[PDB]
Amino acid sequence: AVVKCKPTSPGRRHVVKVVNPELHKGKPFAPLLEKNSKSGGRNNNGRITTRHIGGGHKQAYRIVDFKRNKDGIPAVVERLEYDPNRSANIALVLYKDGERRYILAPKGLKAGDQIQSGVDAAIKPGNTLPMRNIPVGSTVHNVEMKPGKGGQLARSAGTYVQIVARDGAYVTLRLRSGEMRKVEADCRATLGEVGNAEHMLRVLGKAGAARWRGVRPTVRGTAMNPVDHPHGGGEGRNFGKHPVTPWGVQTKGKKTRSNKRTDKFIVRRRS
Amino acid sequence: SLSTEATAKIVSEFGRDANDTGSTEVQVALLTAQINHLQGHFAEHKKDHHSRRGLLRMVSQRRKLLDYLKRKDVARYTQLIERLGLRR
Amino acid sequence: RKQVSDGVAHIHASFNNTIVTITDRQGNALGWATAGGSGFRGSRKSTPFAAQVAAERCADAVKEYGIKNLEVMVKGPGPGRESTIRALNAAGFRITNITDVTPIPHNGCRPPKKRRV
Amino acid sequence: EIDYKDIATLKNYITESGKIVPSRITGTRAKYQRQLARAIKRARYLSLLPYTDRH
Amino acid sequence: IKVRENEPFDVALRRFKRSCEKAGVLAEVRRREFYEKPTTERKRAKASAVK
Amino acid sequence: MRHYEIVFMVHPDQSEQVPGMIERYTAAITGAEGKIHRLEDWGRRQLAYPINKLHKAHYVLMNVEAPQEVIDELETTFRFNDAVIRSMVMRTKHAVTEAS
RNA sequence: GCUUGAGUCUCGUAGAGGGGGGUAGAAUUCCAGGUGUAGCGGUGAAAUGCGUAGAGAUCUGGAGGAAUACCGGUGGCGAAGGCGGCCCCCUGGACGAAGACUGACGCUCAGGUGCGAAAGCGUGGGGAGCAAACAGGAUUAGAUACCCUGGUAGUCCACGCCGUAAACGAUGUCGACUUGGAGGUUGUGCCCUUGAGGCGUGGCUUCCGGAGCUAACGCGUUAAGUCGACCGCCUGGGGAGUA
RNA sequence: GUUUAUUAAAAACACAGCACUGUGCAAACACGAAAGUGGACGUAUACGGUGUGACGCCUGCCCGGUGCCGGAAGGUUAAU
């Protein structure tokens, strides 16, 4: 659960840790590891393109099954592991033919649970099926946008998607943003919601925790100069014009969505 | 509620004479079994204050019965607590 | 120029005002009238005589359609429904049945506290 | 004494709008009135009796 | 609630239009039945009435 | 084992599958070593108010003595299978008059 | 030592007693659509407001939240706060015919501990109605209000606080005795198995009333009557349940 | 903690927190004349932009002006 630290020092005064004793203490599964090198704030042109990304802890990428397959083969769940690359925890699962894979761990999943992925799979948290064998109203996660592509929606910790309706070839989904959108019914979805729902309850306590995450300091345009930001300047604190991005586009309000080939799929815009 | 077969088993176990359902050891053992079952109940169901009042009534009744048995016969009290596993 | 001759009167009566609406059997409304369009304001439109004038004007609006038989569905606590059936029967439709479809809920939503005075 | 599966007795103990008639009108006892209300609600849930006559 | 006109009829009216419970309960579900004061006052009045 | 009473309604469209699910449910109870006290099929029956905008529905009653685990599995089966519009499983008022 | 106080077991009975989950039906609101036109809404009157970009009214489909019309009761349960759709799971208490068992194991309890309406506070959700604050329009001599039109916190859920109420029956708990009538609710014995008919025995309750008590109002077998055990509280009003 | 490495180390900047707003993934946004790339082998408990700056108590009134969001009935209105 959440652990409020004793204020033995400033920086430990205001930190809440979320700790899971169920998580595996030790090395991850080495056949499903890849090299992950830091490249944020670095284009192939070498320029910073996303600001406030820099050095954090070294991390290794875990190959997680998102396009879940091996239909009809049950898999027993071994110990849940920690994943630095995402807010969610992951589960190392072992199929009956001797194949280990990494799964986005749902909320109720424990070590020893059985999961399955086919069209004959019983509907149960941790099982994935296309959304024409899944009843309307169930909360799902790790749901594809195209049939066979892999889960793109509800991958963060604690997130879920509600199956609201069925067209007959499309399935309407209420997303975590409140948006309703039409997704094809042959797209697969894992049942239940994603675990680690206490991830939003952590408070980092100090600037060093953000630096271990990998977030470089954010400078305000009011603190900058007129050459640097559209905000900036003045012989006091007040600038006094409409708030904008560093490149001039207005940032309070001003919806910026220019897609026209997916407007047929978004049904109700998020509120 | 404790089942009829369970109460019959505890009465037969803790009664050295047949049909001794009113003796202090039998009453304390019945209360202890119901207390363990209700601890298993309340772990899943916190905030059941109305049933916890009956639990505390059973705890107080068991404690008063054990106090009476300790005043009456200390050997019976020690034998009962060493076969029940309480009051450390 | 309608040949089916079956119509439904919907009388939404309330303590301020009444509304009469003649529709077909499928729910598509054909005509409507009200005490305010009849020419009464406040207490004069809360009177049941304004409901009689409203139902007469609504029947005048449906005289082009020429409905022979007319169901009646009243709704609300208004005093004007009891004159509205009488005005429609004086207009000349044959009333096959009279129905009361006022919304009597369950506890449901919380009622207001307003107008305590 | 009172079972919800038959319908003729239960329509005799409701009114035309589907409401349960009061015990002061029916003359039945309080225990049987409570059992009657429970059976009426169960039959309403299984749609053997309507909640209201409008729909 | 529901009436249907008998096929011999001289006028269309309702024979229970003043004793109907619909307008009696609608004015109460509009606002605030207390369920502890008015039932007590009504039962006290009934107990004083019947003797 | 605990006594129970299960009444469920099936689609008129899927009214030909009713003996198959009767065999399935009785097989589940007898495999979980319970017994069926009663079983009645009232067939297609007019319903008082329309649910799911649907016509008259197929009515099945059974009185069943079975463990609460297989009764819970039966109720979750009734939840997940969409051929049953409505199900009610009730413990109380057991030992009713036969064929009422 | 005893059972007669207290408790336990067998078999049943009623109940919105509590905790968790699922589901159902009216209704309100919102969205999309069909018909249709010039008003709707509100009030003692109006006006702000909605509607000429189509409101209100009627019908269809969908979404979401909250509370469960009738039953419903001078009913029921819980120590109190309190608890109302239906179904399941776990569970507390009460009562009854009959029999058995232990044998004073009992009563009260300053400190202590737990529970504790509504409003409020923290974190995370939810938000349909209602609605403090706020805004507009009325009323008025004025109106920071009563009234109307909106409307945020809140009301709802999870986990933590807070620990107060006209938390009242303004009546602390336990035990015993003391004339009566009329009902309600819930068990049981007998009679003529022929009926929701008659005669008893228990519990919980509502009203009237005799002696008695009280300053009086009134209480009156569930006492404010006659006693016993223990605890809490008061010593003129204001200051003040304040520093 | 950082800062004008060479006259200013500060109350300045940053900061954990807080809020607003954009973003349904071929995401927003950024670099790029385009391919492509970062964001991210992430997926609304995520990412960006803005302002404020632990914590405690709080954050009142004003939408007339300028922005932004929503609507298209009417007026004006380009190439054609």
Secondary structure string (H, E, C) spanning D29-49: CHHHHHHHHHHHHHHHHCCCC
Please check whether residue C104 is in contact with residue E23, taking contact to mean a CB–CB distance below 8 angstroms.
no
Please check whether residue C73 is in contact with residue C99, taking contact to mean a CB–CB distance below 8 angstroms.
yes
Please check whether residue A162 is in contact with residue A222, taking contact to mean a CB–CB distance below 8 angstroms.
no
Nucleotide nearest to A178 (CA to C1'): H44
Q: Which of residues 8-67 of C touch strand G (CB under 7 A)?
A: 10, 12, 14-17, 19, 21, 23, 26-32, 34-37, 41-43, 45-46
- Nearest by Cα to F5 from F98, F77, F91: F91
Indicate the pairing of strand C18-23 with strand A75-81. Answer: unpaired
Please check whether residue A184 is in contact with residue A196, taking contact to mean a CB–CB distance below 8 angstroms.
no
Chains D and F touch (3+ CB pairs under 8 A): yes
How many residues are present in chain A? Answer: 271
Indicate the pairing of strand E2-4 with strand F2-10. Answer: unpaired
d(C-alpha A30, C-alpha A102), whole Å: 11
Tokens, residue C24: 């077909």
Residue B58 makes CB contacts below 8 A (sequence gap 6+) with: B31, B34, B35, B38
Q: Would you call C67 helix, strand, or coil by DSSP? A: coil
d(C-alpha C59, C-alpha C38), whole Å: 13
Q: From residue E50, how far is each of A207, D22, E43, E46 by CA, in Å?
A: 81, 19, 10, 6
Structural domains of chain C, count = 1
Q: How far is the CA of D27 from the C1' of G195 (A)?
A: 15
Bridge partners of A100, per DSSP, are A94
Please check whether residue D48 is in contact with residue D10, taking contact to mean a CB–CB distance below 8 angstroms.
yes
The range of the structural domain enclosing residue F46 comes to 1-92
d(C-alpha F60, C-alpha D49), whole Å: 17
Contacts of D53 in chain E (CB under 8 A): 1-2
Contacts of E2 in chain D (CB under 8 A): 16, 53
Contacts of F9 in chain D (CB under 8 A): 46-47
Measure the CA angle with vertex A106, ends A104 and A111; round to 5°.
Answer: 90
Structural domains of chain F, count = 1
Report which DSSP code applies to C92: T
- CB proximity E31 to C under 8 Å: yes
d(C-alpha A105, C-alpha A81), whole Å: 9
CB neighbour burial string for C78-94, b if at least 16 within 10 angstroms, e if fewer: bbbbbbbbbbbbebebe
d(C-alpha F96, C-alpha F100), whole Å: 8
Contacts of E20 in chain C (CB under 8 A): 100
Specify the DSSP element, H or E, that contains D26.
helix D23-26
Q: What is the DSSP string of F17-44?
A: SHHHHHHHHHHHHHHTT-EEEEEEEEEE
Q: What are phi and psi of A207, to 5 degrees?
A: -70, -25
Nucleotide nearest to A158 (CA to C1'): H45
Q: Which of residues 21-80 of A touch strand H (CB under 7 A)?
A: 34, 36, 38-45, 47-53, 61, 63-64, 66
Chain-centre distance for alpha carbon A269: 21
Report which DSSP code applies to F100: -
Q: How far is the CA of A165 from the C1' of G62 (A)?
A: 10
d(C-alpha A175, C-alpha A161), whole Å: 5
User: Number of CB pairs < 8 Å for C and E?
Assistant: 47
The residue lying closest to nucleotide G67, measuring its CA against C1', is: C108
Specify the DSSP element, H or E, that contains E29.
helix E22-29
Instruction: Count other Cβ atoms within 10 Å, centred on residue A40.
Output: 16
- CB proximity F27 to D under 8 Å: no
Distance from CA of F32 to the nearest CA of D (A): 27
d(C-alpha A89, C-alpha A110), whole Å: 12
Specify the DSSP element, H or E, that contains A173.
strand A170-174
Please check whether residue A153 is in contact with residue A116, taking contact to mean a CB–CB distance below 8 angstroms.
no
Tokens, residue B75: 């050997």
Mutate to test the interface with A, among F80, F84, F85 (most CBs of A within 10 A): F80
Exposed / middle / buried, residue A61 (Cβ in 10 Å: 0-12, 13-18, 19+): middle
The range of the structural domain enclosing residue C108 comes to 1-117
Strand positions, DSSP E, chain F: 2-10, 35-45, 57-66, 84-90
Nucleotide nearest to A249 (CA to C1'): H49
Residue F21 lies in a domain: yes
Q: Where are the alpha helices (DSSP H) in A84-219?
A: 207-213
d(C-alpha F24, C-alpha F10), whole Å: 15
Measure the CA angle with vertex C51, ends C45 and C52; round to 5°.
Answer: 130
Measure the CA angle with vertex A168, ends A164 and A171; round to 5°.
Answer: 30
User: Domain B1-88 carries which CATH code?
Assistant: 1.10.287.10
- Could you give the dihedral angle defined by the CA atoms of residues A219, A224, A228 and A231, in that order, rounded to the nearest 10 degrees? 100
Q: Where are the alpha helices (DSSP H) in chain C?
A: 35-38, 43-46, 48-62, 81-91
d(C-alpha C87, C-alpha A250), whole Å: 63
d(C-alpha A126, C-alpha A108), whole Å: 8
Interface of C with E (CB under 8 A): 76-77, 82, 85-86, 89, 95-100, 102, 104-105, 111-113, 115
Q: How far is the CA of A115 from the C1' of G53 (A)?
A: 56
Exposed / middle / buried, residue A78 (Cβ in 10 Å: 0-12, 13-18, 19+): middle
Q: Would you call D15 helix, strand, or coil by DSSP? A: coil
Q: From residue A189, how far is each of A59, B76, C10 by CA, in Å?
A: 28, 64, 49
Residue F99 lies in a domain: no
- D38 sits within 7 Å of strand G by its CB: yes
Q: From residue A158, how far is each of A83, A115, A135, A142 by CA, in Å?
A: 15, 19, 21, 11
Q: How far is the CA of B24 from the C1' of G114 (A)?
A: 27
Chain-centre distance for alpha carbon A177: 13
The angstrom resolution of this structure is 3.0
- CB proximity D47 to F under 8 Å: yes
Measure the CA angle with vertex C45, ends C41 and C48; round to 5°.
Answer: 165
d(C-alpha D38, C-alpha C114), whole Å: 36
d(C-alpha A240, C-alpha A262), whole Å: 38
Contacts of F100 in chain D (CB under 8 A): 3, 5-6
Report which DSSP code applies to E33: -
- The structural domains of chain D, with segments of one domain joined by +, span 1-55
d(C-alpha A222, C-alpha A219), whole Å: 9
Q: Would you call F100 and D50 a contact, using CB atoms and an 8 Å cutoff?
A: no
